[PDB]
Design a protein around this ligand. Structure first.
Ligand SMILES: Nc1nc2c(ncn2[C@@H]2O[C@H](COP(=O)(O)OP(=O)(O)OP(=O)(O)O)[C@@H](O)[C@H]2O)c(=O)[nH]1
Ligand SMILES: Nc1ncnc2c1ncn2[C@@H]1O[C@H](COP(=O)(O)OP(=O)(O)CP(=O)(O)O)[C@@H](O)[C@H]1O
Ligand SMILES: Nc1nc2c(ncn2[C@@H]2O[C@H](COP(=O)(O)OP(=O)(O)O)[C@@H](O)[C@H]2O)c(=O)[nH]1
Ligand SMILES: COc1cccc(-c2cc(NCc3ccc4c(c3)OCO4)nc(N)n2)c1
Ligand SMILES: [Ca+2]
Ligand SMILES: [Ca+2]
Ligand SMILES: [Ca+2]
Ligand SMILES: [Ca+2]
Ligand SMILES: [Mg+2]
Ligand SMILES: [Mg+2]
Ligand SMILES: [Mg+2]
Lengths: 425, 54, 349, 438
């Protein structure tokens, strides 16, 4: 059951690279693609993310996309740069200048076809294609504009395959341009319609974590990507490593998404790292449920959990996890919907991430995620009620009403989230 | 409390003890409803592919 | 901390139990239908017993015993007594009683009726139900057929019980009374009797020939507080507690409350509750139960105690709500969910 | 002699089937190669063990079994396993992608593309049956294949084999060992469409097996392996009368006759004792009366309920190993005196009993200790309706908000099959109450 990975834009490609650095090290594959590990468990589910090639080498099933060559020259340059099949580097030259319209309608359309040609050639070589995953930001132009364009094109060719994304949200605390709320609102509406799971990675939270708790005075995009790569690995371990779970992308979607449009998860991780003291299991669980470990800058206690999933990595007492997980639920049982019985599910995998003997990844589907969309929505209107900076978009063909609709669709989404937050049995 | 119908053999025995006495659809209409849900699916996929064409 | 829910809002007793548990600082109340609870204080009818004990990692406890209705509903009460060898046709503390349907005991009843008509015995009788609240649907005749047609007057079942002609009557007043005792059975089937009881007085003087009188005979708290002038003269609320009844018996009859009556009360309590112990005990079950019962007795003039009924959803006397509700927590609840002398007489078995 | 064919569906059905057939071989002296030294009728016969095994000219003894999953990961472990030689490839059927815990995906979408094939591989086994009895179908309530495809199969076996009996072994869902929250949906839909196609079903609440494994084997967190080897012991004692010389329940027809007066109410409660750990080096072996009275402790039941607050319709006792009729009556007499065992008035208050002298066989290296005598009791009590109530409630809660329904509609189902199926168990829940309260 193979997965096809796509990374688009600067952010999309640099978190994407760190992801492949991390898991490639976990499965024991070196920067050349040659496996040199200690366990057979490292390779049993290696076909999920790796094509096996001539001469015992493993090449990620990954497609690298950008509308300018800048950072993908840097990817090819980086630690694991030469791991990727070079045919899968697909890029234009003009760049998208942080413009959703350029990525989705003009500059991106010129190149989208070339990308899906590589998609098809990875799919055709797939025993049974399970689904796609994308890494990208929503505040730029390529990852946002083109990224959502490819997703729409992939749903057209593969209408019955799962499409999940890792999506970086823009926050003023970590801002490139002022038009980010425009690009993110236009993308969210695309994600509402054509993705099964979207992991909301808020750059605000990633900043707060890096500065408040990790106590790093001036966080870099690198320091924020360490948190993303560790979470992306933690999430993907249900499939990357053999539990006695029969984990399937579709199956996991079915068990966490009670309503089609409400598929935006809050990620989390513990322990938060940048030390040697072994961390108790009771400490792992109380951290992952604390908002300070949330990658989405929302308080879980102003909403209610629709579904939850917790992944524990390491050698630990599966009886102590069951004990303390069922303990936290009652410290917070007011914050779990009562009309979805047994909506907190736990998984364990023996192999831990490199550097820590014990880790936990938190995947929450909370109605408190609306706080994120409300935040983006206010920044959006603040400028749109004055048509500020619209000329950058209307010059590429868009009309104001496409903006009005996109705004309306997410104000709808926020309303849908609060329907189920007040709802009771 | 009666014992009755005691049958035995080399593998075992059996009996009954009483303590007190007392006081389908077709083939064609299945594979039609399998087909009635196949078209409900192709109609939903058409409305999507129509939506994407818009 | 511990978790509990409340599904009987009109319950006077467990109202303060819930409030007293909240003041613990170690108990958290949840919404009526959240399933992740350690304790349920459930509705009186159709309590979903089958839904309990299936929540992983949560020991659940409930304030009612599935099957206890066979003791707390007068029709099955009678059936339990005459059908069970442990109690038997041969039961000296329960009045002669018959269940009659408007399985049926219609002519086994008149059989015993004219054997008394014959011999000039007291052919006193009364018919009853658990359906009629507020002393409704009662009928104390001396001839048999006047009630049988008042029985099938209505469409539900009524038991016919020998009425006690010679009750013991306190003085001053020549008044009748009944005794309510509160017994709590915890999860290990320990039988705890509350040391405090109540005499639910009648303030009328008793009149043999005049069974016309609604209030000359019937003693429960509402029929003398809204049907009788004399409510409150001799004692506050037509309620005499155990210290006064003891001293009165001492001064008046040269005996004790323990000796003359309480020994028989403790005998009847434990005889009834262990007759059914096999059918309701939650010893090895996935959920556990406790339940507070109200036992109602009557005393005839020979200082013999008779059992009149057992109530499953009982109300306390307002002076003791504090002491009783606190005892429930210590024994029935925190016994299972521990925290950071005794008011009960243990009836051993 | 009349043959019976077992069908194992989905992960739970397949893995359990693997555990049962393992035990059957140890019991009948069959080896992992299909060779039965003690069988002297080479390449043929009509013994009672031949009801579950066929024979080849080369002396191979082959289960009359069929495995079927919509994804190959689990049946692949059978094709590489210790008993790989036992089965032949046409009996093991695999799709490529599963039903993702979606009844609609298992029944409608992926179902129809594989239903004809399965039935073809089923008939390749019935064609070698001189006088076929029927089928024993293993499956979970919660899986999308286990629930969805089984109900489709059971529908067309009732037409392609209208006169043959069909018994179910069903795994009722428990959250302690399950990672899926839509299992209440799948169980309701499959029970509703399967109900008038199954003659008798034994349902096993994983919750009960779990706690039995924890209490009486002191395994802190049981695995599926722990659960299945215990489950197959129960299943083994239930089918032993078909595989061994005897006079009781020698035919799948007798199961409905002895245990099922009303057809809808065909879910007998199974209780089993004793369960003893193999780490308890040695143990004070329990009498007949001790194990027989253990059959009325809810803590040994396959579904947690309270049979004191229901009424019985039928009761079998299947002792294994070393028991004599007179020690049973001794026990039965003592139990009536101390237990609340009320029958429906329109049925006798009696116990059909069966004894086979071979003690329970147990897997070498398993977690279960060898015992001198064991019993499995089959009670058709109305108290099992508690399990339906629990399930139906969890269904009411989510469906009132239509949670997860879009997943089923997207695979072709209609929202009405939900309430149509829920209405059925509304009748089933009340059918039970009519029969067992006053
Ligand atoms: N007793 C027991 N239960 C199992 C076993 N495997 C899965 N289950 C239970 O069955 C449910 C999952 O259903 P599965 O059988 O795995 O699903 P399936 O039949 O393969 O159908 P799919 O949804 O397509 O995978 C969970 O509730 C488990 O508790 C097993 O080996 N033994
Ligand atoms: N056999 C009998 N002889 C004399 N008096 C009797 C009697 N049976 C009942 N009574 C009288 O009837 C009165 C109340 O009857 P009963 O208690 O059974 O109704 P009830 O259950 O609706 C009130 P509660 O629920 O508060 O206990 C008693 O106080 C008692 O004095
Ligand atoms: N976490 C993270 N976010 C980034 C990174 N680079 C850009 N972003 C985010 O995306 C915005 C810039 O968008 P960008 O990725 O350059 O868009 P694109 O390259 O044109 O597709 C800012 O709001 C950043 O927060 C990165 O390396 N890490
Ligand atoms: C690109 O997108 C991906 C890629 C890889 C994995 C996931 C993923 C993981 C996950 N883990 C929790 C979890 C839930 C239910 C479970 C469980 C584990 O084990 C059994 O039942 N949940 C979901 N919804 N998606 C998403
Ligand atoms: Ca151009
Ligand atoms: Ca092209
Ligand atoms: Ca032979
Ligand atoms: Ca049939
Ligand atoms: Mg940039
Ligand atoms: Mg009453
Ligand atoms: Mg499966």
């Amino acid at each position: 059951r193979e997965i096809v990975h796509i990374q688009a834009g600067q952010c999309g490609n640099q978190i994407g690279a760190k992801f492949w650095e991390v898991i490639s090290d976990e499965h024991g594959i070196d920067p050349t693609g040659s496996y040199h590990g200690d366990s057979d468990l490292q390779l049993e589910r290696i076909n999920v993310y790796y094509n096996e090639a001539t001469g015992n080498k493993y090449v990620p099933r990954a497609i690298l996309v950008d509308l300018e060559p800048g950072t993908m020259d840097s990817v090819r340059s980086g630690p694991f740069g030469q791991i990727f099949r070079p045919d899968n580097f697909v890029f234009g030259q003009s760049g998208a200048g942080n413009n959703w319209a350029k990525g989705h309608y003009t500059e991106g359309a010129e190149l989208v076809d070339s990308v899906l040609d590589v998609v098809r050639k990875e799919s055709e070589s797939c025993d049974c294609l399970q689904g796609f995953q994308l890494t990208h930001s929503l505040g730029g132009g390529t990852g946002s504009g083109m990224g959502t364009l490819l997703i729409s094109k992939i749903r057209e060719e593969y209408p019955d395959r799962i499409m999940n994304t890792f999506s970086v949200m823009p926050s003023p605390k970590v801002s490139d341009t002022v038009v980010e709320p425009y690009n993110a609102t236009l993308s969210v509406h695309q994600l509402v319609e054509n993705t099964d799971e979207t992991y909301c990675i808020d750059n605000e939270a990633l900043y707060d974590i890096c500065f408040r708790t990790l106590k790093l005075t001036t966080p870099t995009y690198g320091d924020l990507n360490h948190l993303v790569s560790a979470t992306m690995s933690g999430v993907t371990t249900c499939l990357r490593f053999p539990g006695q779970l029969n984990a399937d992308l579709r199956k996991l979607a079915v068990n966490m998404v009670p309503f089609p449009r409400l598929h935006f998860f809050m990620p989390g991780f513990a322990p938060l790292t940048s030390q040697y003291r072994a961390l108790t299991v009771p400490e792992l669980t109380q951290q992952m449920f604390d908002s300070k470990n949330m990658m989405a800058a929302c308080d879980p206690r102003h909403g209610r959990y629709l579904t939850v999933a917790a992944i524990f990595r390491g050698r630990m007492s599966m009886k102590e996890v069951d004990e303390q997980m069922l303990n936290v639920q009652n410290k917070n049982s007011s914050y779990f919907v009562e009309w979805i019985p047994n909506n907190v599910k736990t998984a364990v995998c023996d192999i831990p991430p490199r550097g820590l003997k014990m880790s936990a990844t938190f995947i929450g589907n909370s109605t408190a995620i609306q706080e994120l969309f409300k935040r983006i929505s206010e920044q959006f209107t603040a400028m749109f009620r004055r048509k500020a900076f619209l000329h950058w978009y209307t010059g590429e063909g868009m009309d104001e009403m496409e903006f009005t609709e996109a705004e309306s669709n997410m104000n709808d989404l926020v309303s849908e989230y609060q329907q189920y937050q007040d709802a009771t049995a | 409390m009666e014992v009755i119908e005691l049958n035995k053999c080399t593998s075992g025995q059996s009996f009954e003890v009483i303590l007190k006495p007392p006081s389908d659809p077709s083939l064609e209409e299945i594979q039609k409803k399998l087909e009635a849900a196949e078209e409900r699916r192709k109609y939903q996929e058409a409305e999507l592919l129509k939506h994407l064409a818009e | 901390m511990y978790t509990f829910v409340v599904r009987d809002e009109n319950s006077s007793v467990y109202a303060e139990v819930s409030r007293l548990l909240l003041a613990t600082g170690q108990w958290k109340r949840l919404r009526k239908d959240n399933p992740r609870f350690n304790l349920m204080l459930g509705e009186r009818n159709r309590l979903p017993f089958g839904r309990l004990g299936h929540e992983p990692g949560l020991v659940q406890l409930v304030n009612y015993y599935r099957g206890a209705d066979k003791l707390c509903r007068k029709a099955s009460l009678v059936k339990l007594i005459k059908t069970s060898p442990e109690l038997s046709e041969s039961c000296t503390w329960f009045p002669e009683s018959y269940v009659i349907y408007p399985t049926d005991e219609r002519e086994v009843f008149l059989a015993a009726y004219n054997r008394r008509r014959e011999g000039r015995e007291g052919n006193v009788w009364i018919a009853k139900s658990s359906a009629g609240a507020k002393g409704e649907g009662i009928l104390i005749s001396s001839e048999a057929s006047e009630l049988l047609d008042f029985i099938d007057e209505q469409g539900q079942v009524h038991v016919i019980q020998k009425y006690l002609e010679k009750p013991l009557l306190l003085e001053p007043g020549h008044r009748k009374f009944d005794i309510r005792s509160w017994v709590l059975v915890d999860h290990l089937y320990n039988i705890y009797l509350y040391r405090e009881g109540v005499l639910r007085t009648s303030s009328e003087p008793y009149n043999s020939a005049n069974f016309q009188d609604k209030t000359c005979h019937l003693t429960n708290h509402c029929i003398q507080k809204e049907y009788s002038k004399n409510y409150g003269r001799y004692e506050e609320g037509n309620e005499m507690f155990f210290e006064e009844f003891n001293q009165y018996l001492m001064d008046a009859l040269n005996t004790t409350l323990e000796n003359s009556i309480l020994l028989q009360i403790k005998h009847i309590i434990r005889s009834c509750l262990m007759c059914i112990e096999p059918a309701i005990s939650t010893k090895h079950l996935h959920y556990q139960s406790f339940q507070l019962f109200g036992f109602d007795f009557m005393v005839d003039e020979e200082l013999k105690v008779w059992l009149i009924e057992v109530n499953g959803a009982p109300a306390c006397a307002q002076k003791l709500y504090a002491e009783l509700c606190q005892g429930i927590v210590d024994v029935a609840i925190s016994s299972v969910f521990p925290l950071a002398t005794s008011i009960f007489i243990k009836l051993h078995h | 002699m009349r043959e019976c064919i077992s069908i194992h569906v989905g992960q739970a059905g397949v893995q359990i089937g693997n555990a049962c057939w393992e035990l059957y071989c140890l019991e009948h002296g069959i080896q992992p190669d299909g060779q039965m030294p003690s069988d002297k009728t080479i390449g043929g016969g009509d013994d009672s063990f031949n009801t579950f095994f066929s024979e080849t000219g080369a002396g191979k003894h082959v289960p009359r079994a069929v495995f079927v999953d919509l994804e190959p990961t689990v049946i692949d472990e059978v094709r590489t396993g210790t008993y790989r030689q036992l089965f032949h490839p046409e009996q093991l059927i695999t799709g490529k992608e599963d039903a993702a815990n979606n009844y609609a995906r298992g029944h409608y979408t992926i179902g129809k593309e594989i239903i004809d094939l399965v039935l073809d591989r089923i008939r390749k086994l019935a064609d070698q049956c001189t006088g076929l009895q029927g089928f024993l179908v293993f499956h979970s309530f919660g899986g999308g294949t286990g629930s969805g495809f089984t109900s489709l199969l059971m529908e067309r076996l009732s037409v392609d084999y209208g006169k043959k009996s069909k018994l179910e072994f069903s795994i009722y869902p428990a959250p302690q060992v399950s990672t899926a929250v839509v299992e209440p949906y799948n169980s309701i839909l499959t029970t509703h469409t399967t109900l008038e196609h199954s003659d008798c079903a034994f349902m096993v609440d994983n919750e009960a097996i779990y706690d039995i494994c924890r209490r009486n084997l002191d395994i802190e967190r049981p695995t599926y392996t722990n659960l299945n080897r215990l489950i197959s012991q129960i299943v083994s004692s239930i089918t032993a009368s078909l595989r061994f010389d005897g006079a009781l329940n020698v035919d799948l027809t007798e199961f409905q006759t002895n245990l099922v007066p009303y057809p809808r109410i065909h879910f007998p409660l199974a209780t089993y004792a004793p369960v003893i750990s193999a780490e308890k080096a040695y143990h004070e072996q329990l009498s007949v009366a001790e194990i027989t009275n253990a059959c009325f402790e809810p803590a040994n039941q396959m579904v947690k309920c309270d049979p004191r607050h229901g009424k019985y319709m039928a009761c079998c006792l299947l002792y294994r190993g070393d028991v004599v009729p007179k020690d049973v009556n001794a026990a039965i007499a003592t139990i009536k005196t101390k237990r609340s065992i009320q029958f429906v008035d329109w049925c006798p208050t009696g116990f059909k009993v069966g004894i086979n002298y071979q003690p329970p066989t147990v897997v070498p290296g398993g977690d279960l200790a060898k015992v001198q005598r064991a019993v499995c009791m089959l009670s058709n009590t109305t108290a099992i309706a508690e399990a339906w109530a629990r399930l139906d409630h969890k269904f009411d809660l989510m469906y009132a908000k239509r949670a997860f329904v879009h997943w089923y509609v997207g695979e072709g189902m209609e929202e009405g099959e939900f309430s149509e199926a829920r209405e059925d168990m509304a009748a089933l829940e009340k059918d039970y109450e009519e029969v067992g309260v006053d």
